[PDB]
Amino acid sequence: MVVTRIAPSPTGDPHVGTAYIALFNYAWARRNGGRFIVRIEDTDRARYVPGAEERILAALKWLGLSYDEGPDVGGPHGPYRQSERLPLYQKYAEELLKRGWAYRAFETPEELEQIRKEKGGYDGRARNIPPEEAEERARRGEPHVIRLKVPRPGTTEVKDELRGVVVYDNQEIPDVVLLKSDGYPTYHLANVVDDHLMGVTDVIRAEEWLVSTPIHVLLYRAFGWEAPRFYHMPLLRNPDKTKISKRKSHTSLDWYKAEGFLPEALRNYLCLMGFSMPDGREIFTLEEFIQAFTWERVSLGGPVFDLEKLRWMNGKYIREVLSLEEVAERVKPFLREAGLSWESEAYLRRAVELMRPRFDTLKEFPEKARYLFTEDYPVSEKAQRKLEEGLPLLKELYPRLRAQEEWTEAALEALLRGFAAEKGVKLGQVAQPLRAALTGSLETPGLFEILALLGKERALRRLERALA
Ligand SMILES: Nc1ncnc2c1ncn2[C@@H]1O[C@H](COP(=O)(O)OP(=O)(O)OP(=O)(O)O)[C@@H](O)[C@H]1O
Ligand SMILES: N[C@@H](CCC(=O)O)C(=O)O
Ligand SMILES: [Mg+2]
Numbered sequence: 001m002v003v004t005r006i007a008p009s010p011t012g013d014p015h016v017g018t019a020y021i022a023l024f025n026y027a028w029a030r031r032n033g034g035r036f037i038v039r040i041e042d043t044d045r046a047r048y049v050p051g052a053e054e055r056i057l058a059a060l061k062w063l064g065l066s067y068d069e070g071p072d073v074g075g076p077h078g079p080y081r082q083s084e085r086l087p088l089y090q091k092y093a094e095e096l097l098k099r100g101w102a103y104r105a106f107e108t109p110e111e112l113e114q115i116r117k118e119k120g121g122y123d124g125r126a127r128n129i130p131p132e133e134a135e136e137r138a139r140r141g142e143p144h145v146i147r148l149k150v151p152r153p154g155t156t157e158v159k160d161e162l163r164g165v166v167v168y169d170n171q172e173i174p175d176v177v178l179l180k181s182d183g184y185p186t187y188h189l190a191n192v193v194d195d196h197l198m199g200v201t202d203v204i205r206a207e208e209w210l211v212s213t214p215i216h217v218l219l220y221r222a223f224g225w226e227a228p229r230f231y232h233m234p235l236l237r238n239p240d241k242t243k244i245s246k247r248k249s250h251t252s253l254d255w256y257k258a259e260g261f262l263p264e265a266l267r268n269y270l271c272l273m274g275f276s277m278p279d280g281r282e283i284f285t286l287e288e289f290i291q292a293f294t295w296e297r298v299s300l301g302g303p304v305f306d307l308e309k310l311r312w313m314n315g316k317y318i319r320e321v322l323s324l325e326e327v328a329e330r331v332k333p334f335l336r337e338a339g340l341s342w343e344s345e346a347y348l349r350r351a352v353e354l355m356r357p358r359f360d361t362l363k364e365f366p367e368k369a370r371y372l373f374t375e376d377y378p379v380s381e382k383a384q385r386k387l388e389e390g391l392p393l394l395k396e397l398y399p400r401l402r403a404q405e406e407w408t409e410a411a412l413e414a415l416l417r418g419f420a421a422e423k424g425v426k427l428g429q430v431a432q433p434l435r436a437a438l439t440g441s442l443e444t445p446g447l448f449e450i451l452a453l454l455g456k457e458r459a460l461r462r463l464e465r466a467l468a
Contacts, residue, residue, distance in 0.1 A: 001032075001033075001034050001035065001087060001201070002028065002029055002033075002034030002201055002202055002264075003029070003034055003035045003036075003198070003200050003201045003202065004025040004026070004029045004034065004035070004036050004037070004200065004202045004203075004204055005025060005036065005037045005038065005039055005198065005202075005203075006018060006022040006025055006038055006039075006060075006067075006338060007037055007039045007040075007041045007191065007194075007195075007202050007205075007251045008023055008038075008040065008041065009040075009041040009042065009044060009047075009054045010042055010048075010049065010051055010052035010055075010056055010408050011041065011044075011047045011049065011052065012047075012049050012053065012246075013052075013246070013251070013252035013253070013254055013255070014052075014055045014056040014058075014059035014060075014252065014253040014450050014460045015246060015252070015253070015254055015268070016236070016244075016251045016256070016266075017206060017235075017236060017244070017251065018056060018059075018060075018253075019060065019126055019234060019253055019266075019267075019270055020058065020064075020233070020273055020274070021205055021206055021269045022060055022063075022065055023065065023267065023270050023271060024204050024233060024274060024275075024298075025202075025204045026065050026066075026067075027267070027289060027290050027293045028202060028204060028231075028293065029202075030290045030430055031290055031293045034065075034201075035068045035069070035073065035398050036066075036067050036068055037067055037068055037069035037070060037080075037198060038057070038067045038069065038071065038080065039058070039080050039081075039194055039198065040056075040070075040071055040080060040081040040083075040189070041080055041081045041190065041191070042082055042083045043083055043086070043184050043185060043190065045184070053071065053081075054176075054349040055254060057071070057072060058137070059253040059257070060255065062253070062257060063253075063263045063266065063285075064263055064264065064286050065267075065339075068443075069198075070320070071406035076197045076220060077197060077199065082185075082190050082194065085194070086149075086183065086184065086185070088193060089094055089179065089184075089185035089189055090179065090183060090185075090374070090457075092189065092193050092223070093146045093178055093179040093185070093189060095223070096146070096148070096149075096178070096222055096223075097131075097146065097256065098179045099222060100147050100149065101222035102146050102147060102148055102149055102178060103126055103127050103129075103131075103134065103146070103147055103149050104126065104129075104134040104135075104137070104144045104145070104146055104255055104328075105122075105128065105144055105145055105146075105175075105176075106126065106129075106134075106137060106142055106143065106144040106165075107122075107124035113172050115465070121146075121174050122174060122175060123149070124149075124150075124152070124175045126147070127149060127175075131356070136168050139182055141361065143181045144181060145177045145178075145179060145180055145181050146177070146178050146179040146187070147175040147176060147178060148175055148176050148178050148215065148218060148219065148222075149175060150170050150174070150175050150203060150218060151170055151218075152171075153169075153170060153171065153464065154170040154207075154406075155167055155168060155169055155170055156168045156173060156216050156218055157217075158213045158214050158218055158230070159230065160210065160213070160230050160231065160232050161229050161230060161295065162231055162232065162295060162298060162300060162326060163210075163232065163300065168214045168215075171280055171448060172212075172214075172314045173214050173218070174400065175217060176188055176215055178219075182355045187212075188212065188215050188216065188219065189219070191216065191221060191259075192216050192219040192223075196220070196223070196225050196226060199227050201228050201229065202228055202229045202231065203228050203229065203230050203231065204231040204232075204233060205231075205232060205233065205237050206232065206233055206235055207232040207233060207234055208235055208243070209232065210232045213230055213232075215347075225249070225461035232287075233274050233294065233298070234273075234274055234299065234300055234302050234303055235302060236273055236303055236304075236305045237302040237303060237304050237305065238304070238305070238393050239304055239306065240302070241302055242320075244305055250307075253266075258363070259361055259363050260314075260334060260361035260362030260363030260364065261310065261311075261314050261318050261361055261362075262314055262318070262322075262330070262362070264285075264286075264311065264321070265310070265313045265316075266313040266314075266315060267286060268282075268283060268284060268285075268289075268313060268317075269305075269309070269310050269313050272303075272404055273288075273303040274298050274299065274303055275289070275293070275298050275299070276297055276299070276407050277292055278292065280347050282313070283313070283316060283317075283320075283321065286390050289447065303404055309359040310429075310453060311326075312360070314360050314361055315359070315360035315361075318356065318359070318360070318362075319356050319357060324349060324352060324353055324356070325337065325349070327352050327356065327362075328345070328348050328349050328352045330362055331348075331352060331362050331366070332348075333362075333363045334363050334365060334366050335365075335366050335373065336350075337366070338366035338367070340366055340370065340371060340373040340374055341373065341375075350453060351372045351373070351453075352365070353443060354369075354445040354446070354449055354450070354453070355368065355372075355383050356371045358444075358445060358446070361436050368441075368443075368444075371438070371439040371440055371441065371444075372453070373452075375462075377439065377440045378440055379436070379440035379441075380440065380441055380442070382434075382442055383436040383440055383441050383442050384436070386433055386436050386442055387433050387436035387437055387466060389433065390429065390430065390432065390433025390434075390436075391466075391467070392432065393423065393425070393429065393430055393433060394430075394434060394437060394463065394466070394467065395467055396423075397419055397430065397434070398463055398467060400415060400419060401415070401459075401463065402460060404456070406458040407447050407455070408452055409446065409448040409451070409452050409454055411447075412448050412451050412452060416430050416431060416434070416448075430465045431447050434447065435450075435452075435462075436466075437462060437463050437465075437466035437467075438450060438451065438454075438459060438462050438463070
């Protein structure tokens, strides 16, 4: 049975990289009728932010993913937070000492810097301290760390299921710290101990972890454990091919959610980052992704995460995937956040229908259609000048509009058409100023559709205000 996992180290915001990796772990598990678990690697007591773990779990669920074991759902091999299993790492570190696969090192930071400048890294000199002396110094409270005792000289072979076998000269592998001086584990020790105890059979993670694998293979060998299958996914890249980073761009899943990106669209886009459908389709469901999933179609090149492409897909979901009713429901939270209400469901549905071809994110709806839900809408600098330019035309138009009994799109259109001819100007010279007066914008949907949507009286009210 296949068992995959995600092992996020929460820091602040839920990272899009976590969603990307989670997506493929979830797919590989489901495709094989296996299990997908969540382990929180929260031992970094400097980067701990209350609520960060919860935000990650919520984002995974928001994206439509689900997991089988974890901090909140529980499971047969918990605890699922590394902060709750600190004693395990220490006992396993002690086991390595007993096996001769690890040793205590007492160098101060000043000493390590000197050694690094002389040898290019730590040279394992502490391996020459008599074991019994190292234990006594430890018993006496001397500060130290426990390092992996890499076989010197030697070689370590590592197999990545997508890239193949890599033969490392052990001289490329340092005697990495496994247990820190404060008793906390390093990533290498905790990751191997927990993947083993949780029964992980398939490790799928970002390629930046690839070079850490030989260390993990040595640890599995040291404990006498069977190593799982390793799959390293390409890192998400910026247009310039550099690695996407939270310090350089928007990687927060909460930002995407707040910006009005649909979970189904973001999920669909992440699928396209490390995979392509046989037929080439770009729009598909999570179920279809799983059914068609195969490592044979996972590219190893750097996938470019293009925000503009994401917005395009989001827009395609808004007008071609979801129903009008679904969109109207989803824009509600954004309307309320913008301090806007809607007279009725029928009205809202109509507003969404008119704006649907004009917004790519749910957040843009309240921003571009504010004038449809409140009289307190902003008037752009460009719209104001256009209104001013056509004010005299509108003033002469006001009377005709007030007398207009048939307040429909076709009727109003005919009225402006005749008026424009009467004044010797093109229809647009009258339409633009009117649009500005009724919406405070020059970029809106059908002027005539907007003219009649609000009703005659309310429309005249705004024209009056612009003429006041
Ligand atoms: N470009 C990327 N593609 C895929 N996964 C990534 C990428 N960057 C980070 N990750 C993954 O996202 C998670 C969070 O990593 P991290 O908090 O270091 O964010 P970061 O963007 O790498 O920030 P930093 O530049 O400081 O390293 C980790 O699981 C990491 O492997
Ligand atoms: N906690 C590590 C886990 C890496 C792994 O998949 O082994 C990270 O932040 O992704
Ligand atoms: Mg990073």
